[PDB]
Design a protein around this ligand. Structure first.
Ligand SMILES: OC[C@H]1O[C@@H](O)[C@H](O)[C@@H](O)[C@H]1O
Length: 329
């Protein structure tokens, strides 16, 4: 009876949130808490309704991975009036003074890693170039998407400036490359139209993809126009989440890279935070400057992500138990 914790996850259409949810609940119950885990099927009104009910139920702490956190201002105010502490999980909740802590991966660094996998593969440090690249971003209502993109551009921009990388479509910036709701179908269509408009004569050499779901759609589009044959190899395509279909793609020599974010580690950080709040102590945080949310800078704990390719998938994903060997066959 250490108290109840409400856990709001955005959707099951992206594999990780099932893992986040399972891992948070497993560790919280091990720590002796009761849990109320809900998934919103990416429906913003539903997620709001779910969190409202957690508040009415009288949970002591809310752990929220929001679809669009800006929609939660009113309910989080009510949570604060009731003495409920709020942990933003993975994605920062913006526009609210009632967000107490933020547990996440180093999102800027995720972007650095995605871009670096591409630049390393292209040999840009060896003076290789020029190459054509197209850019994709996440959902614009996901605060993480801006960090993934910015982190990537910290690596790519100097090469784009020098001409060694060329964005042939000229499309850059989250307002132009963002992919609403991280929808793979949308990214696939955009890739379709980039190819027809700008790559009838030229070839795509790389695509910055911020998420595995998108990477698979992008690859499908590329195969639709003849890439992925012996004569015409796929461009270098990044990713994130180490979803099984993308890992299989990487093993097959299609998708080039992904980013492994161990949800077991993020659940553990979250439990540490819950424990602290419940004991009346200050949670461990390692970043109190970065994550401005529009009202304040939320004290945060950042975990370090790991880049995965065909070269290291076994050691990173299987040896550490995230997946079993057979799942990747
Ligand atoms: O769901 C699409 C993406 O959403 C981001 O906010 C999250 O950090 C990524 O790991 C990925 O899951």
């Amino acid at each position: 009876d250490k108290g109840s914790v409400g856990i709001a996850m955005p959707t099951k259409s992206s594999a990780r949130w099932i893992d986040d949810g399972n891992n948070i609940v497993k560790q919280l119950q091990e720590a002796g808490y009761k849990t109320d885990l809900q998934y919103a099927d990416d429906d913003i009104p539903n997620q709001l309704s779910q969190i409202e009910n957690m508040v009415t139920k009288g949970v002591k702490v809310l752990v929220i991975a929001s679809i669009d956190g800006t929609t939660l201002s009113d309910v989080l105010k009510q949570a604060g009036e009731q003495g409920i502490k709020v942990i933003a999980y993975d994605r920062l909740i913006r526009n609210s003074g009632d967000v107490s802590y933020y547990a996440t991966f180093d999102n800027f660094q995720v972007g650095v890693l995605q871009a670096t996998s591409i630049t390393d593969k292209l040999g840009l440090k060896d003076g290789k170039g020029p190459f054509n690249i197209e850019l994709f971003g996440g959902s614009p209502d996901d605060n993480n998407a801006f960090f993934f993109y910015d982190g990537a551009m910290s690596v790519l921009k100097p090469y784009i400036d020098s001409g060694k990388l060329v964005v042939k479509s000229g499309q850059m910036g989250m307002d132009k490359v963002g992919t609403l709701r991280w929808d793979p179908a949308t990214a696939q269509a955009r890739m379709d139209n980039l190819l027809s408009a700008y790559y009838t004569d030229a070839k795509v050499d790389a695509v910055l993809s911020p998420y595995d779901g998108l990477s698979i759609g992008i690859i499908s589009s590329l195969k639709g126009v003849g890439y992925g044959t012996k004569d015409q190899p796929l461009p270098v395509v990044s990713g994130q989440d180490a979803e099984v279909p993308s890992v299989k793609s990487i093993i097959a020599g299609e998708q080039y890279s992904t980013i492994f974010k161990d949800t077991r580690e993020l659940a553990k950080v979250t439990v540490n935070m819950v424990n602290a709040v419940m004991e009346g102590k200050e949670p461990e945080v390692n970043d109190t400057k970065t994550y401005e949310n529009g009202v304040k800078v939320v004290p945060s704990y950042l975990l370090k992500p790991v880049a995965v390719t065909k070269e290291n998938y076994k050691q990173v994903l299987v040896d550490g138990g995230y997946y079993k060997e057979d799942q990747l066959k």
